[PDB]
Amino acid sequence: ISRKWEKKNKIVYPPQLPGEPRRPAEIYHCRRQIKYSKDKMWYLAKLIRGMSIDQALAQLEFNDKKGAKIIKEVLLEAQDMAVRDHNVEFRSNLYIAESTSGRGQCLKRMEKVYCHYFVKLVEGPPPPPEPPKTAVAHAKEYIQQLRSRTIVHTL
């Protein structure tokens, strides 16, 4: 029983200088004791891993699994808290920075499974996906490796 996640919304950074880039805000949120396995919640958690909040809600509204509505309620509460307390400007300017599912506590009869859901929303637009490794990049790195060979085992 460790309540660490909800304590990362309390780190008070130092007041920004007028020069440095505006720091993107954050909000951490968690749902505890979801009556649902973790090896099933993981798929929903990974689905919405790298997409903005509104697309995530859209994708969850139309998925069949039982945990979809739990994740949706969690994300809505997170968005409301982010606007109301964490001084976020636009409630659509958020994206799922981290989404994960973890084990839970309660007892057996045959384990009665439980799970927690952990979400970190980061202000700003989604980062673009890592592009595919173009053939020129592969040739460039192969040349780099060919050009770092030294005479092995001598002066």
């Binding site: 919304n9 008070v12 950074y13 007041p15 920004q16 720091r23 805000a25 964490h86 001084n87 409630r91």
Partner: protein, 157 residues
Amino acid sequence: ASQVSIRRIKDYDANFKIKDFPEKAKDIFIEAHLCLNNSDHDRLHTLVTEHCFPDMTWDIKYKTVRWSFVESLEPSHVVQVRCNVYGQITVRMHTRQTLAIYDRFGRLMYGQEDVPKDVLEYVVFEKQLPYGSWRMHTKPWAPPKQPILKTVMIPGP
């Protein structure tokens, strides 16, 4: 004016420095508003009662306020005092403040840094009528308001 209520003050306190009251009031005002910028709310516990301490401390957590006092426009003069009695004393004050609140990530969300600007106050101190000492208790026709840096939405009914 209200000498009938102030008779209780004279009887109980037995000191009643009437003209020193503005000085003490200004001192406690600047002190209380001075220690809102350090997370050192323990002394703010004894500088304000539980009536208006919980709001003055909870709605400021995770907000790096940096207040400041720069001048008093004119000397502060006492106002009418009324008075199973907690002694409430109201003091009018024209002061010169600067204020710059920040969010828990360090981004400005109210006021400018120096911007030394004037403020009008109807402050009200209260004190147990014993050991309990002076405590700020409360703070206008229609003075203007400085906007917020943030743009908001008000949903429909």
